[PDB]
Amino acid sequence: AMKKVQGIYRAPRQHWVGDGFPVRSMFSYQSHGKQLSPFLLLDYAGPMDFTPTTQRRGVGQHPHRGFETVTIVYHGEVEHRDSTGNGGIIGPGDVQWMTAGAGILHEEFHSDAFAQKGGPFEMVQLWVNLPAKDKMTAPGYQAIRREAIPQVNLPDDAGNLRVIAGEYAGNIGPAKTFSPLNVWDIRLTQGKSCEFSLPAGWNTALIVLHGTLLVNGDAIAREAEMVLLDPTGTHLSIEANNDTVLLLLSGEPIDEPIVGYGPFVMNTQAQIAEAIADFNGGRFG
Ligand SMILES: [Cl-]
Ligand SMILES: [Fe+3]
């Protein structure tokens, strides 16, 4: 049975987050919290060509509690830091999987080397919800190098698929997750197709970053457009009308309340009050 298309969304207008992240917001939990669980948010930064500068372009220090932050870099370099000292630089092909859990205080910005040279800048920011029993887990980092991400060639020379989280054809993703989910990065060659088998009941989305994609032989998605699929079903097929780049997100739904405000995503409104109180009380970190 097919995971049939139940919603397709046009490219959103771009807004600026800080001075370093020109993003198009694909979805958020306010409107797609139940339908996209475990995924809370997807921003698509760029593509943008940045000029050399002495500025440190990025976003200021800000808190997070109750979920995980995933940064997938395609072009450019970003550096992340937190008030603890946990830091690092994410370059092309690299992934950072950040667990905010109990609470974190961090900032993201263009790396010092990217500031000097400029050039293409493109990446995805994804938020992954935590089960209630884990929403206060210790904050943790996972700097995932491009080399450590399996790259599986697709049958019929259709393209390749990077297994960031989950599993595909026996190749296991390096991302450590708290609940069952897949995060795949797919290049599909024009004229080629591929059919996938996913777990029944898993919420599934396709986000097209480049190209023209025909989903289940019906809907067509292009740059910055998103297909939301029926979670009831185990199958889907994609075809590349042009050389395509897409993200495939799929996960077992977290059947728990979502109460979120800005940087805090918890289970109860009382937990959001506690979160804001901790942050303004200086107890956050
Ligand atoms: Cl500086
Ligand atoms: Fe952040």
Tab-separated table of C-alpha atoms and ligand atoms in Angstrom:
chain	number	residue	atom	x	y	z
A	1	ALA	CA	0.000	0.000	0.000
A	2	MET	CA	1.112	3.525	-0.827
A	3	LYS	CA	1.688	6.469	1.456
A	4	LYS	CA	-0.523	8.699	-0.683
A	5	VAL	CA	0.081	12.430	-0.997
A	6	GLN	CA	-2.153	14.378	1.385
A	7	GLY	CA	-0.606	17.850	1.100
A	8	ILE	CA	1.845	19.742	-1.110
A	9	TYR	CA	3.107	23.193	-0.203
A	10	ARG	CA	4.470	26.033	-2.293
A	11	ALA	CA	7.854	27.576	-1.618
A	12	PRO	CA	7.582	30.019	1.305
A	13	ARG	CA	8.941	33.544	1.257
A	14	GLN	CA	12.429	33.996	2.678
A	15	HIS	CA	13.078	35.776	5.960
A	16	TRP	CA	16.319	36.576	7.763
A	17	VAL	CA	17.216	34.922	11.069
A	18	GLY	CA	19.962	37.134	12.398
A	19	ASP	CA	22.283	38.359	9.664
A	20	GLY	CA	23.703	34.973	8.690
A	21	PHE	CA	20.718	32.744	7.915
A	22	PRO	CA	18.387	33.605	5.015
A	23	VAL	CA	15.780	30.919	5.590
A	24	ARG	CA	12.572	29.623	4.093
A	25	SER	CA	10.487	27.920	6.790
A	26	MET	CA	9.153	24.638	5.409
A	27	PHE	CA	7.060	23.743	8.452
A	28	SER	CA	6.672	24.287	12.187
A	29	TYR	CA	4.858	22.471	14.977
A	30	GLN	CA	2.102	25.093	15.311
A	31	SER	CA	0.360	23.891	12.146
A	32	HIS	CA	2.136	20.563	11.557
A	33	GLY	CA	2.887	19.266	15.048
A	34	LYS	CA	0.748	16.142	14.934
A	35	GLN	CA	1.161	15.460	11.223
A	36	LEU	CA	4.965	15.713	11.182
A	37	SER	CA	5.872	14.178	14.546
A	38	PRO	CA	8.631	13.561	15.517
A	39	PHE	CA	9.814	16.517	13.406
A	40	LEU	CA	9.061	19.977	14.801
A	41	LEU	CA	10.553	22.466	12.342
A	42	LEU	CA	12.507	22.679	9.091
A	43	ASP	CA	14.222	25.843	7.883
A	44	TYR	CA	16.050	25.935	4.543
A	45	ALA	CA	18.908	28.454	4.534
A	46	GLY	CA	19.859	29.711	1.096
A	47	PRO	CA	21.353	29.068	-1.298
A	48	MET	CA	23.072	32.438	-0.867
A	49	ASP	CA	26.425	33.876	-1.981
A	50	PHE	CA	28.098	35.764	0.865
A	51	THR	CA	30.844	38.335	0.362
A	52	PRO	CA	34.048	38.575	2.421
A	53	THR	CA	33.506	40.434	5.677
A	54	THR	CA	34.956	41.067	9.106
A	55	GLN	CA	31.430	40.626	10.477
A	56	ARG	CA	30.517	37.443	12.329
A	57	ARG	CA	27.172	36.778	10.650
A	58	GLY	CA	24.848	34.414	12.486
A	59	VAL	CA	22.382	34.510	15.382
A	60	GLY	CA	22.958	35.631	18.936
A	61	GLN	CA	22.995	33.423	21.991
A	62	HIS	CA	19.568	31.931	22.642
A	63	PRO	CA	18.104	29.073	24.700
A	64	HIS	CA	16.519	25.749	23.779
A	65	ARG	CA	14.761	23.094	25.847
A	66	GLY	CA	12.873	19.897	25.117
A	67	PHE	CA	14.050	18.803	21.662
A	68	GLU	CA	17.047	18.236	19.397
A	69	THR	CA	18.595	20.551	16.795
A	70	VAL	CA	20.007	19.165	13.531
A	71	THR	CA	22.190	21.174	11.136
A	72	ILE	CA	22.902	19.741	7.672
A	73	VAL	CA	25.475	21.778	5.734
A	74	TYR	CA	25.651	21.640	1.934
A	75	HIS	CA	27.757	24.752	1.226
A	76	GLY	CA	29.750	27.002	3.532
A	77	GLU	CA	30.955	26.570	7.090
A	78	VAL	CA	29.105	27.316	10.304
A	79	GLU	CA	30.557	27.352	13.791
A	80	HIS	CA	28.488	26.542	16.863
A	81	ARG	CA	29.258	27.165	20.531
A	82	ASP	CA	27.416	26.931	23.829
A	83	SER	CA	27.868	28.486	27.258
A	84	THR	CA	29.409	25.197	28.432
A	85	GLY	CA	32.322	25.189	25.992
A	86	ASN	CA	30.991	22.608	23.566
A	87	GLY	CA	31.769	23.924	20.098
A	88	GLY	CA	32.982	23.038	16.628
A	89	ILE	CA	32.787	23.858	12.946
A	90	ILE	CA	30.417	22.228	10.447
A	91	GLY	CA	31.501	22.157	6.816
A	92	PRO	CA	30.126	20.799	3.541
A	93	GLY	CA	28.762	17.298	4.005
A	94	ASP	CA	28.994	17.480	7.805
A	95	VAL	CA	26.080	17.182	10.230
A	96	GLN	CA	25.638	18.379	13.806
A	97	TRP	CA	23.027	16.638	15.974
A	98	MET	CA	22.458	18.715	19.113
A	99	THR	CA	20.398	17.514	22.080
A	100	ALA	CA	19.051	20.496	24.000
A	101	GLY	CA	17.178	18.285	26.463
A	102	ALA	CA	17.143	19.846	29.915
A	103	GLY	CA	18.329	23.140	28.441
A	104	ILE	CA	21.120	24.757	26.418
A	105	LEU	CA	22.443	28.242	25.609
A	106	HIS	CA	24.156	28.447	22.241
A	107	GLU	CA	24.874	30.529	19.154
A	108	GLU	CA	25.496	29.728	15.486
A	109	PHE	CA	27.424	31.823	12.979
A	110	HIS	CA	29.587	31.726	9.876
A	111	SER	CA	33.004	30.251	10.595
A	112	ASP	CA	36.057	32.491	10.711
A	113	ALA	CA	37.339	31.006	7.449
A	114	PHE	CA	34.005	31.485	5.675
A	115	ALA	CA	33.877	35.097	6.861
A	116	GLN	CA	37.276	35.743	5.261
A	117	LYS	CA	36.548	34.132	1.880
A	118	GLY	CA	32.793	34.214	1.349
A	119	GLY	CA	31.062	32.081	-1.228
A	120	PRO	CA	28.068	29.757	-1.424
A	121	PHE	CA	26.090	29.152	1.762
A	122	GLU	CA	23.339	26.535	1.977
A	123	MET	CA	22.016	24.345	4.772
A	124	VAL	CA	18.986	22.840	6.499
A	125	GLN	CA	17.995	23.266	10.145
A	126	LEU	CA	15.686	20.585	11.532
A	127	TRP	CA	14.101	20.264	14.981
A	128	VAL	CA	13.366	16.779	16.335
A	129	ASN	CA	11.051	16.376	19.311
A	130	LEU	CA	12.020	14.304	22.364
A	131	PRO	CA	9.747	11.806	24.130
A	132	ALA	CA	8.408	13.204	27.398
A	133	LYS	CA	10.629	10.849	29.408
A	134	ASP	CA	13.668	12.343	27.630
A	135	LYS	CA	12.807	16.058	27.364
A	136	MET	CA	15.108	16.824	30.311
A	137	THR	CA	17.949	14.558	29.248
A	138	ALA	CA	21.445	15.965	29.504
A	139	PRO	CA	22.390	18.295	26.631
A	140	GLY	CA	24.751	16.603	24.219
A	141	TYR	CA	26.497	17.088	20.897
A	142	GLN	CA	27.215	14.856	17.899
A	143	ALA	CA	29.551	16.406	15.337
A	144	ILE	CA	29.082	14.011	12.413
A	145	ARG	CA	31.734	14.184	9.717
A	146	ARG	CA	30.884	13.745	6.040
A	147	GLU	CA	33.071	10.631	5.979
A	148	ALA	CA	30.956	8.960	8.686
A	149	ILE	CA	27.662	9.281	6.754
A	150	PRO	CA	26.901	6.208	4.586
A	151	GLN	CA	26.391	6.964	0.891
A	152	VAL	CA	24.292	4.262	-0.791
A	153	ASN	CA	24.038	4.167	-4.571
A	154	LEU	CA	20.494	3.590	-5.761
A	155	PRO	CA	19.514	0.728	-8.092
A	156	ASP	CA	19.451	1.338	-11.843
A	157	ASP	CA	22.056	4.110	-11.435
A	158	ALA	CA	19.216	6.326	-10.204
A	159	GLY	CA	21.400	8.274	-7.775
A	160	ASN	CA	22.577	7.993	-4.196
A	161	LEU	CA	21.164	8.364	-0.701
A	162	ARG	CA	22.992	9.567	2.413
A	163	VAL	CA	21.773	7.862	5.592
A	164	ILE	CA	22.061	10.564	8.247
A	165	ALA	CA	19.646	8.979	10.733
A	166	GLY	CA	17.941	5.606	10.693
A	167	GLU	CA	18.650	2.853	8.178
A	168	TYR	CA	18.507	2.199	4.445
A	169	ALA	CA	19.260	-1.206	2.882
A	170	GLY	CA	21.338	-2.229	5.906
A	171	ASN	CA	23.411	0.977	6.080
A	172	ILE	CA	22.887	2.579	9.505
A	173	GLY	CA	22.987	6.336	9.992
A	174	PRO	CA	25.489	7.783	12.468
A	175	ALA	CA	22.865	9.971	14.178
A	176	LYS	CA	21.866	8.827	17.667
A	177	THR	CA	18.109	9.314	18.045
A	178	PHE	CA	15.721	8.948	20.984
A	179	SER	CA	12.863	7.585	18.830
A	180	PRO	CA	12.672	5.678	15.525
A	181	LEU	CA	13.159	7.987	12.557
A	182	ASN	CA	14.899	8.360	9.209
A	183	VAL	CA	16.696	11.395	7.824
A	184	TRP	CA	17.894	10.705	4.277
A	185	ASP	CA	19.655	12.999	1.801
A	186	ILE	CA	18.884	11.937	-1.770
A	187	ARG	CA	20.331	12.945	-5.135
A	188	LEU	CA	18.112	11.599	-7.920
A	189	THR	CA	19.210	11.781	-11.554
A	190	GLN	CA	16.794	13.105	-14.181
A	191	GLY	CA	14.751	10.350	-15.783
A	192	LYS	CA	15.487	7.934	-12.933
A	193	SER	CA	13.041	6.692	-10.309
A	194	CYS	CA	13.122	4.807	-7.022
A	195	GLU	CA	10.519	3.116	-4.825
A	196	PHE	CA	10.925	3.026	-1.049
A	197	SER	CA	9.437	0.868	1.698
A	198	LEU	CA	8.790	2.661	4.993
A	199	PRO	CA	7.228	1.502	8.274
A	200	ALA	CA	3.452	1.601	8.440
A	201	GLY	CA	2.135	4.503	10.479
A	202	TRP	CA	5.292	6.600	10.110
A	203	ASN	CA	4.717	10.259	9.305
A	204	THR	CA	6.658	11.039	6.136
A	205	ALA	CA	7.637	14.236	4.321
A	206	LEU	CA	9.674	15.041	1.214
A	207	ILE	CA	11.392	18.427	0.907
A	208	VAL	CA	12.722	19.316	-2.545
A	209	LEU	CA	15.799	21.534	-2.391
A	210	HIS	CA	16.643	21.408	-6.115
A	211	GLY	CA	15.075	19.987	-9.242
A	212	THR	CA	11.650	18.683	-10.199
A	213	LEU	CA	10.242	15.617	-8.451
A	214	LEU	CA	7.196	13.532	-9.383
A	215	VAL	CA	5.850	11.816	-6.255
A	216	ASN	CA	3.778	8.620	-6.537
A	217	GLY	CA	3.324	9.336	-10.245
A	218	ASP	CA	1.012	12.269	-9.516
A	219	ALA	CA	2.197	15.368	-7.655
A	220	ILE	CA	5.114	17.498	-8.847
A	221	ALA	CA	7.368	19.319	-6.371
A	222	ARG	CA	10.087	21.864	-7.151
A	223	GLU	CA	12.585	24.067	-5.282
A	224	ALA	CA	11.720	24.667	-1.613
A	225	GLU	CA	8.408	22.806	-1.977
A	226	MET	CA	7.235	20.093	0.369
A	227	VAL	CA	5.114	16.969	0.014
A	228	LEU	CA	3.367	15.607	3.097
A	229	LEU	CA	2.389	11.939	2.834
A	230	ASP	CA	-0.278	9.728	4.375
A	231	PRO	CA	1.331	7.864	7.318
A	232	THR	CA	-1.015	4.923	6.710
A	233	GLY	CA	0.901	3.004	4.059
A	234	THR	CA	4.292	1.423	3.523
A	235	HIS	CA	5.308	2.429	-0.005
A	236	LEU	CA	6.133	5.403	-2.188
A	237	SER	CA	7.907	6.111	-5.454
A	238	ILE	CA	9.751	9.205	-6.637
A	239	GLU	CA	10.870	10.212	-10.114
A	240	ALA	CA	13.254	12.957	-11.207
A	241	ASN	CA	11.916	15.173	-13.977
A	242	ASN	CA	15.213	17.034	-13.543
A	243	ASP	CA	18.343	16.347	-11.518
A	244	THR	CA	16.871	16.488	-8.025
A	245	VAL	CA	18.101	16.981	-4.470
A	246	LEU	CA	15.640	16.210	-1.689
A	247	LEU	CA	15.366	15.464	2.011
A	248	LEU	CA	13.268	12.488	3.089
A	249	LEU	CA	11.964	12.704	6.663
A	250	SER	CA	10.090	9.798	8.231
A	251	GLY	CA	9.481	8.817	11.825
A	252	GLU	CA	7.297	7.031	14.299
A	253	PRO	CA	4.852	9.602	15.724
A	254	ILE	CA	5.369	10.741	19.305
A	255	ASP	CA	1.848	10.397	20.721
A	256	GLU	CA	2.250	13.011	23.444
A	257	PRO	CA	1.118	16.623	23.932
A	258	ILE	CA	3.102	19.371	22.219
A	259	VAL	CA	3.065	22.745	23.977
A	260	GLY	CA	5.706	25.052	22.547
A	261	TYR	CA	6.612	28.714	22.530
A	262	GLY	CA	9.558	30.078	20.592
A	263	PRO	CA	12.658	28.178	21.687
A	264	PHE	CA	10.861	25.936	24.232
A	265	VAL	CA	8.925	22.830	23.165
A	266	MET	CA	7.539	20.815	26.081
A	267	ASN	CA	4.497	18.711	27.005
A	268	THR	CA	2.523	21.005	29.327
A	269	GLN	CA	1.913	24.736	29.482
A	270	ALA	CA	3.268	24.594	33.031
A	271	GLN	CA	6.566	23.285	31.646
A	272	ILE	CA	6.725	26.290	29.308
A	273	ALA	CA	6.241	28.633	32.264
A	274	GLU	CA	8.995	26.774	34.128
A	275	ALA	CA	11.238	27.032	31.055
A	276	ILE	CA	10.779	30.795	30.693
A	277	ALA	CA	11.258	31.257	34.443
A	278	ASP	CA	14.529	29.296	34.394
A	279	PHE	CA	15.874	31.331	31.474
A	280	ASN	CA	15.026	34.719	32.997
A	281	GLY	CA	16.196	33.444	36.381
A	282	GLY	CA	19.629	32.703	34.941
A	283	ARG	CA	19.272	28.971	35.643
A	284	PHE	CA	19.456	28.009	31.955
A	285	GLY	CA	22.522	26.119	30.752
B	1	CL	CL	34.024	38.799	16.011
B	2	FE	FE	20.151	27.408	17.821
